[PDB]
Amino acid sequence: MREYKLVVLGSGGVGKSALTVQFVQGIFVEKYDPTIEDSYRKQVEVDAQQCMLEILDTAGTEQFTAMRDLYMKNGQGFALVYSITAQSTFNDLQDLREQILRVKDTDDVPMILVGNKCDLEDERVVGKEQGQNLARQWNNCAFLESSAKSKINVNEIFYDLVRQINR
Amino acid sequence: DKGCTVEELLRGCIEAFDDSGKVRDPQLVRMFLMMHPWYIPSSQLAAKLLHIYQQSRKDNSNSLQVKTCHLVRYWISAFPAEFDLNPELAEQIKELKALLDQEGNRRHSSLIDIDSVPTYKWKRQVTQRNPVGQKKRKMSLLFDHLEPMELAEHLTYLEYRSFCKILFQDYHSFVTHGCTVDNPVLERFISLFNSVSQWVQLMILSKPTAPQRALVITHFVHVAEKLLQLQNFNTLMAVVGGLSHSSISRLKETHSHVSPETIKLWEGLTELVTATGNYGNYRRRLAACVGFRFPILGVHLKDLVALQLALPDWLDPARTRLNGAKMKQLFSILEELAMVTSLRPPVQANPDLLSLLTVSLDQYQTEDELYQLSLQREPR
C-alpha cells in the first residue's frame, strides 16, 4: 500500500478545514482530536489501488513562512482551494502556486484547483470557466468544484490528486 | 458534566472552594477562569459573581459570601494582567470591593486588592525604537566568529521575551479569526519568527562564493542543533525551515560544498519538525522534555483552529449549554502554552549582542528580492 502526502492550501474564508474534516472524519465527527497522529489519515482505494492518504491542513499556519515552506517541500500533492463567493480568494492562488514551484525547482507539480462552496450559487462571483482556464494554463492540471456542506466532490478532490501524483 | 451552562459552571466554580479558602479541585476553576471569554465576556462574568454575592448577602449565607470572595481572589491572583488591562472588569471588582466595605465590615474586604499586581500594561503597547543611519553590518562580520551555542541562546531569549507578551485574549482572537486581525502582540511574535528565518536566508545569500555560503549553512545547522539541545523547538523551526526556503534550496552549487555529516545532521533536524504524522516526532520530543521548553507556536495554533472550526461552541441552538469536550480540549492546549511562561530559559545573554541581533533581524526583504539575490549568486 502506497502512502501519499496531500497538502491543502487556500485563503482564510475558504473552509479548507471543512473539506479536510469531511473527507477524513466524515459527516459524523462524534469525538474529534487534531493532535493525534491518525486524525488526518484515511485509507482510500483509487484506480484499483489501495493507498494511505495523509492530509496536511494549513489551517492556522499560513502566517509562519518556515512552516509553509516545509509543507511545500514535504508535500507530494497540493490542493489549492478557493471560494466561489470571493474573487480575491481565487486570485490569491497564483502566488501559492509560484511558491510551490519555487520550493520544488521543477514546474511539474501534482496539483488540483478546487472551487469550494459550490452550492452557494446565488452568491457565486467567479465562474467555472475561470478555474477551467487557470487549471488549463497551470500545465493542464485537474479542476473541480465542491461543497463541503452539500457533500459534492469531497472525496474526488483527493482521488484526482492521487491520480495526478501517479500521472 | 455534559450540557453545563455558564451559570451552572460558575456556581460549580464557587462550590469548589472551602470556607477556609482551600481549593478542592483546582483544575475546574482554572479551566473556567481562563476559558470563559470564549463564551462570556469577563466583565459580565464578574457582574454575575457580584450578583451572586449580593443575593447571598441578603440571605445571610456566610459560606456563599466567603466562597465567592475566595473565587474572586483566586481569579485576581491567577490572571492579573486581564484585571489591569480590562477597565470594565476592574470596575466590577471596584463595585464588589465597595459592597465588601459596606456589608462585610472589612472582614473580607482585605481579601481583594487590585493594585498588588506587578504588571506593566504598556509592555504590550511599547514598541522598540533604534537609531537611524546605523549601518549595522557589524553583525554580519560578527556572526562568523560567534560561537553557535551562544547565538542560539541569544535567539532563544529574544523569542521568549516576545512570547511572554502574549495573553489569552491574543490566542482567542487568533483562533476566532484564523489569522491575526487587530492582534499586534501575536503579530509581532510571528513577525519576529519570520525575521529570524529571513535573517538566516540573508546571512547565507550575503557570501559571494559558494563554499562560504556552504560554511554559513553549516553554521546555521549547528545553531539549530544547539537550539534543539536548548529544547527551543520554536526557533529551531525558524532556522531549519529558513534553511529550506526556496531561495537557498535551489543553491545546488553551495549545496555541493556542505559536508555529508552536516547533511546527515541537517536532514535529522528537518525530520524532527516534519508535518508528517501530524508533527508526531515534535510532539513526542516535546512530551519527553523535562524543565524549560519552547513549543513551536503554530502547531498548537493549528490544533486550536482545527478544534474551533470542527466542534461547535454550544450544544443547543439557544447558545446556553457549553460543549464540554471542546472547552476541555482547547484548555488542554492553552494551559500548556501558558505554562511556558512559568519557566525562564537557562540562558546567559549580554544585552549588547541582543541589540545587535534585533537590529539585524529588523531588515526586511520581500520573498522576490531574496529569490533575485539567489539568482544572482547562482543563475540557471
Numbering used by the authors:
A (entry chain B): 1 to 167
B (entry chain A): 8 to 387
Sentences from the paper on this structure:
One family of these GEFs is comprised of the Ras guanine-nucleotide releasing proteins (RasGRPs) that can activate Ras or Rap, of which there are four in humans. The N-terminal portion of the RasGRPs contains the catalytic module that is common to other GEFs that operate on Ras-family members.
We found that RasGRP1 and RasGRP4 are specific for Ras, whereas RasGRP2 has a clear preference for Rap1B. Instead, we determined the structures of the catalytic modules of two other members of the family, RasGRP4 and RasGRP2, bound to nucleotide-free HRas and Rap1B, respectively. Comparison of the structures of the RasGRP4:HRas and RasGRP2:Rap1B complexes show that nucleotide-free HRas and Rap1B are bound in a similar fashion to the two RasGRP proteins, and that the binding mode is similar to that seen in SOS:HRas and Epac2:Rap1B complexes. An intriguing aspect of the RasGRP2:Rap1B structure is that the linker connecting the REM domain to the Cdc25 domain (REM-Cdc25 linker) is ordered in its entirety. The sequence of the linker is conserved between RasGRP1 and RasGRP2, but is drastically different in RasGRP4. A prominent feature in the active RasGRP2 structure is the formation of an ion-pair between Arg 131, in the REM-Cdc25 linker and Asp 177 in the Cdc25 domain (Arg 181 and Asp 228 in RasGRP1). This salt bridge and the position of the REM-Cdc25 linker reinforces the active conformation of RasGRP and is incompatible with the autoinhibited conformation. The positioning of the REM-Cdc25 linker in the RasGRP2:Rap1B complexes places the side chain of Thr 134 close to the side chains of the positively charged Lys 172 and Arg 195 in the Cdc25 domain, which provides a possible explanation for the activating effect of phosphorylation of the threonine residue, which adds a negative charge. The high sequence conservation of the REM-Cdc25 linker between RasGRP1 and RasGRP2 suggests that the linker might adopt the same conformation in the active states of both molecules.
